Symmetry: D2
Amino acid sequence: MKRIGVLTSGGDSPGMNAAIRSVVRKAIYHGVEVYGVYHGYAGLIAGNIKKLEVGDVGDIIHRGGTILYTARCPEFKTEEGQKKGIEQLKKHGIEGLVVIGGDGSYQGAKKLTEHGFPCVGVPGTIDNDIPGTDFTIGFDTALNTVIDAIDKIRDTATSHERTWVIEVMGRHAGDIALYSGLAGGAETILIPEADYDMNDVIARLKRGHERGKKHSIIIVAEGVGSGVDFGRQIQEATGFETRVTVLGHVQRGGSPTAFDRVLASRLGARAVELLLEGKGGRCVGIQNNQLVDHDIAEALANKHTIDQRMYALSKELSI
Amino acid sequence: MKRIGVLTSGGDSPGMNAAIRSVVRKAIYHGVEVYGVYHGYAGLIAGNIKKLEVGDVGDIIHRGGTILYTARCPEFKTEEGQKKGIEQLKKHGIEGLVVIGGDGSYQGAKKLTEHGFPCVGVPGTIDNDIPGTDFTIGFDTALNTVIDAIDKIRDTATSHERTWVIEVMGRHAGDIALYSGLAGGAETILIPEADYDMNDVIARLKRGHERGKKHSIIIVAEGVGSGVDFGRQIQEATGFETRVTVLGHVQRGGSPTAFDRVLASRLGARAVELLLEGKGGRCVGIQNNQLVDHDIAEALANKHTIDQRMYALSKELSI
Amino acid sequence: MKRIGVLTSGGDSPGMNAAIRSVVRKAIYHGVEVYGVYHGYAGLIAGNIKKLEVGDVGDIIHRGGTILYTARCPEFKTEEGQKKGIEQLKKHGIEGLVVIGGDGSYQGAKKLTEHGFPCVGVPGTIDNDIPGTDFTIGFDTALNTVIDAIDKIRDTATSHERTWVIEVMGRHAGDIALYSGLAGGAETILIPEADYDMNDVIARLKRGHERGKKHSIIIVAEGVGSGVDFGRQIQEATGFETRVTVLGHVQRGGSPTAFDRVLASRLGARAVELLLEGKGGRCVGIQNNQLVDHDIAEALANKHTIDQRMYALSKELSI
Amino acid sequence: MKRIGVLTSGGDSPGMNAAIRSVVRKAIYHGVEVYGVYHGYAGLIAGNIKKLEVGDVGDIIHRGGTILYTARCPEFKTEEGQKKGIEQLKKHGIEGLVVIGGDGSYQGAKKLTEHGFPCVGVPGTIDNDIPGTDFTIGFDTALNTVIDAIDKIRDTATSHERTWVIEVMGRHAGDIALYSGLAGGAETILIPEADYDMNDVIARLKRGHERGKKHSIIIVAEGVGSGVDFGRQIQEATGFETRVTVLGHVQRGGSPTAFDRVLASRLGARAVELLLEGKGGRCVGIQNNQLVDHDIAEALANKHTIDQRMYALSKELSI
Ligand SMILES: O=P(O)(O)OC[C@H]1O[C@](O)(CO)[C@@H](O)[C@@H]1O
Ligand SMILES: O=P(O)(O)OC[C@H]1O[C@](O)(CO)[C@@H](O)[C@@H]1O
Ligand SMILES: O=P(O)(O)OC[C@H]1O[C@](O)(CO)[C@@H](O)[C@@H]1O
Ligand SMILES: O=P(O)(O)OC[C@H]1O[C@](O)(CO)[C@@H](O)[C@@H]1O
């Protein structure tokens, strides 16, 4: 290919920029031009495409968000829509396209491909739940943002011997919850992937109470409910003072950590490769510490599961 | 003196441990024994006191919160209950008490003195609302956890061209906001110290939209309502995709920044200084960049304010 | 005043931006086109002056360094160059100027006022060695970067019961060293503004090591010597395991801390007000929590000096 | 088994405590009571033991260093010492043992075993230079600590157009330097695992300084020489002012990132499981995101290497 493109759709996440720079340079290294697609798919259809000069991506490897922006486009859900984009692409000479974002980005990746247009997806989401990859760009950066709050909230959670409930993110996934909570010495972690009996969860609270430790920290994935509620439920069931904190989009910003800047660069570059190599309709990820690339279709077919043994661990490591 | 105790009442802030250490150290440097009145005034009644050794308050200078704990206590706001207070101090041979906390702690220091117990107060609250001190221990730290969150949020707020409403603490004061907002370059800071107007805001909030900047950050001093409400408000009035984030208690925990460590050590050291110099019914606080002494009563009679000129600058600079 | 300029000369410092931002924004608020001279006075000669828009300075309030770039240039010390300087100044129609940077620039700020051209200076530097202000842009940020490192070191030093000697910057000034350790928890702070007897330093580390603390953090202001040397002299006299760590320009960068961003804003805005209020040859700064402004003359006549009362403190809380 | 011991030998790293934590909790949860051996093998020999109460490992899962302490100890390399230890252990009813640390401690791990003693390894070191694992407790934290420093240096390096050299640790391994550079975006990384023509290097820099790449950052693993040398050496041949910073031991301290807490917890209790699951003379680790365990012997017999692909990747993403 002579020139390819890059766009980021879905919720932004820390590291996408790394991935952007990776893609841009790695491409520029093989003497390929990279055009930037602004405002995710929406801009694709709108025809928002500016040539990305090597100058543009240097100096942002350490930045949160996406210099390319990312919107939500409904039009890009219909033939007539995808087509109007597949043309705007050709309009500028573009021959392939790199997509960085959530699983919704893949839907387009696939369709766009089913129309005879080379598209690879790079997993970029703090939720850590795109299939075909153990981690996603932004996960370590969110997990670290969270455990960092769990640490600050633990200082004061101890000071007033209060019981705490942090509300994380990762929608229908318990990853930012599990990994995080474990990482924080969370007395209990509530995630989708596994069942929890709110009664027992309140029994141990009373138990671990007698044991001397009056401050407890409950980590709840927003996927299984709402901290706010769980808060009141615990305060009334027990009697222990209680506060509730919903971190928020803070789990979406900030400069990315080591692991995410690397992963972003390795995957981002591993995408430019699959295109120039002819392959299309592929998604790049990392499994068992190894760069893998799958079929967006057979890839989405799978489910997102967590390591139950970890949820288990976190249970035995807090009594 | 011979023996002097220390306690932390009210909401814990970053820098108390620092101030504690500075007391436990400054006093020992004068052969004065100290004591920990644990769990705020709750212990001063319960008799939860202990001896503090220089090896105890050492290595805790960087820790958020208070080792001595804190908790509310109504029995003390009375008299019949505060009588067991002076006694739990007598029986132990304590002569002077160093109080660290909010405007509410000062009370248990204004009454104890008017009872024959030298008491000194040390501003330890993130709100920055204590009278008789430009800055209270914890402020700069909290004030920093806030801007460190504004920075992650502007990330995801810039990538999605969204409008934001940040809910910052500080109860009835607008310091944690006016400052952070200004620091984090917000487009609008709403504090109880100044009359705003959603009509004037939504007017400027829009001009900036069409002008060029499609994302805005709105810091709201939790003392003017809720963010959620302004969120849903900004939303309905503009159609603008909006989100709200309530940082919350994270602003209370964390490792104190440099400025609180230095202040918590200077104030806990100027406080102990008085419990020796004799006068024991005062409270310390850095005023005009100088350590000053104040009559717990002649100071608490004052009202905390903000630098209008500073708020007026947030107006000019942000537009 | 209808079109002022803004350049930065000297070592960059986390904050210079919050200020450039503040300068421009403020200026525009008053209808005064703002141009930026790149690479300090050096560029002023070259005529490296470009117009600045409110957009240019949008989203840099939280970045370190100076987007305006900085650089040395002896030229501007010889009036032959100063002559070439006023040239580029009126060549582009620049009436007034705002110098951000170390004191090495102040000199050039005064001179320009003599050639009949406005010139206000903004104290920007991590050393905190500019007369006329208690704090300079970059101090608190740098002052922080350090303590973050002492916290880190303290861990590795503790587990290995080792004696350490960190080396902070600040030229001939001791500020960075002083506030660092004090908040850092150092046992010794060697600064230029105070005398020390290495014999005493050993006498302490050798007495403390005999007691409970089997590790210490010796902060050494780069201005008095080199940590690599005291680290040698110390591991010789005491025979204690020792390591020396020299914090580099990691102190020169980072993202301005709360206190810093604000100060920069305040000092930068007030910088524009002066130029317009017809003043000149002055220089803003903060003294006694008040926004002051002196003449670049009567100021430099004064001399920067740490607060001994704090050093003696740094010594007392140690023992 | 009813009683086991845990010890930290070798250079401390962030996460060791978190790892201690699980080895203590996982034990308690299984009835086994765990005795903590302070000061590594040196402490074993001296008989420094103490029962680890469940409340001891409480609130340390976010701390650096090792609550246990570490030291180097030749006496254990001799036959006289290994016998002194087998004796001290069997004196306090110790049946198995937990050893966390570098490849050094692994030795004694394998020793104690031959002398009939169940010991399990746990990769603890920021070097990531230990065999039988893709990662070691500390790598990640040191990895960010490095990239955070590179982000600051990039600021001043940029403001002044300075070519920079950063000397990172890792003894003989190039892991820290590889990932750091790759993730900090170093224009050139130098390591022990791959040759480098210090000529080509210069050549590239000489080409960038012309292509607006007026500033670069070189990462030198310490096991490839001193950055101070390469520093002056680059300045000499090119002429661009250069600066060198040796992060020193700030790479060893500070609180551990999310990952390291997850890995340590996972590994610790995984070691504990082996002591009970009747194993021994083995070492746990994480290869290909799988908690596998190996024999301390055949494992140490193996060698450590880096991923050439990354280095190559690091050379393309930089020009
Ligand atoms: O406000 P938004 O943009 O819809 O994002 C909320 C959701 O998106 C994410 O931020 C990313 O998927 C999730 O963590 C969360 O459930
Ligand atoms: O949950 P609590 O105990 O009311 O504490 C939160 C409140 O207290 C403070 O932390 C201190 O006054 C405020 O900032 C805040 O409004
Ligand atoms: O980065 P340079 O140009 O070598 O200068 C180092 C000196 O400049 C400063 O960064 C600022 O004065 C000092 O801290 C230090 O002594
Ligand atoms: O001065 P020390 O404590 O021996 O440490 C230097 C070596 O130890 C480590 O800190 C840990 O192995 C390495 O980074 C380095 O090679």
